[PDB]
Design a binder for this molecule. Structure first.
Ligand SMILES: [Cl-]
Ligand SMILES: [Mn+2]
Ligand SMILES: [Mn+2]
Ligand SMILES: [Mn+2]
Ligand SMILES: [Mn+2]
Ligand code: NA
Ligand code: NA
Length: 327
DNA sequence: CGGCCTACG
DNA sequence: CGTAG
DNA sequence: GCCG
């Protein structure tokens, strides 16, 4: 079992679902208390279990597995013995956890905002609605649309949304392309948002594209919310439904064709996979990776990539298709 | 022990 | 501060 | 919380 998640296939579905879910509760809880290191370890340990070829049935099967020490091993031990880990259940039940989860799930609210609101004694969505003078425009949108945004986005929704984005992109800039990214590209059947990456085969033609796309979607009556030389737009779309509609989070991202493979890689995820890939790149290969490129700080050069395959090769990693990047 | 991804709005 | 994967 |  390699130590970095980018060095091993991680399928969407696996053989240790219960165990990984328990560790991810602890990861999430650590994030709520500002401990990113503990979040990372619990996330990595969970991801290791996702990568195993069969279920863990005994404690001995953890021996030698990366990211399993005293704490994560105890969590697994208690689940194997009793079907439940008391620490995990204590977190699930805490007012702190439930409220921080509720608040941080609001679009426009991060851990810091949620925590300050928690400390001020606020607990419910109606508590926030009663004092809306404090809220940002983004948080107001997040709160108004919260119910719809909690409903899973389905594959049918994605196909509908892709068509309308293509229509607007085609008018904004003939020849421009739209690629589905994020969780749906990794094979997920549901999600909480749809991610698209837009480019054009002629380098430079994509300049100024996103405002033109946004203005056109706005005029078609499809934009319930957006933030406005920008390249990422976090929107709430109005998606047609039987006799009605629902609000759906959509991210639209633009990259020049030179950067497309890096942007595609970054935006396809998973979040943990990409953090691990960037960590690997820097620590093991001395190369700096982001969604724009891959930089050699010795030679002071950028690696030209024509594909995701190119990027894995330049990092000395076996290629993983998107459906094996579910770390 | 230090490090933990790296960006844009 | 928020957002993204 | 774990690793390297
Ligand atoms: Cl016991
Ligand atoms: Mn997504
Ligand atoms: Mn998104
Ligand atoms: Mn996300
Ligand atoms: Mn994400
Ligand atoms: Na949030
Ligand atoms: Na850019």
């Amino acid at each position: 079992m390699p130590a970095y998640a980018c060095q091993r296939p991680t399928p969407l579905t696996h053989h240790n679902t219960g165990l990984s879910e328990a560790l991810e509760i602890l990861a999430e809880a650590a994030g709520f208390e500002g401990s990113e290191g503990r979040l990372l370890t619990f996330c990595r340990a969970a991801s290791v279990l996702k990568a195993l070829p069969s279920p863990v049935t005994t404690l001995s099967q953890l021996q030698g597995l990366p990211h399993f020490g005293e704490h994560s091993s105890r969590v697994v031990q208690e689940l194997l013995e009793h079907g439940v880990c008391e620490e995990v259940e204590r977190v699930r039940r805490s007012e702190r956890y439930q409220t921080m989860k509720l608040f941080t799930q609001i679009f426009g609210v991060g851990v810091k905002t949620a925590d300050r609101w928690y400390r001020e004694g606020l607990r419910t969505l109606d508590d926030l609605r009663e004092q809306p003078q404090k809220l940002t425009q983004q948080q107001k949108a997040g709160l108004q649309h919260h119910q719809d945004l909690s409903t899973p986005v389905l594959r049918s929704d994605v196909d509908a949304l892709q068509q309308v984005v293509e229509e607007a992109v085609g008018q904004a800039l003939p020849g421009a392309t739209v690629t589905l990214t994020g969780g749906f590209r990794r094979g997920k059947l549901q999600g909480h948002d749809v991610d698209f990456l837009i480019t054009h085969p002629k380098e430079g033609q994509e300049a100024g594209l996103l405002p033109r796309v946004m203005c056109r979607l706005q005029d078609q009556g499809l934009i319930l919310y957006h933030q406005h030389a920008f390249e990422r737009s976090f929107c709430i779309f109005r998606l047609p439904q039987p006799g009605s509609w629902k609000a759906v989070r959509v991210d639209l991202v633009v990259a020049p064709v030179s950067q497309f493979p890096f942007a595609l890689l970054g935006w396809t995820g998973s979040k943990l996979f990409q953090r691990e890939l960037r960590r690997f790149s820097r620590k093991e290969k001395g190369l700096w990776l982001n969604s724009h490129g891959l930089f050699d700080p010795e030679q002071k050069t950028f690696f030209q990539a024509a594909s995701e395959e190119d990027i894995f090769r330049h990092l000395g990693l076996e290629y993983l298709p998107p459906e094996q990047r579910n770390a």
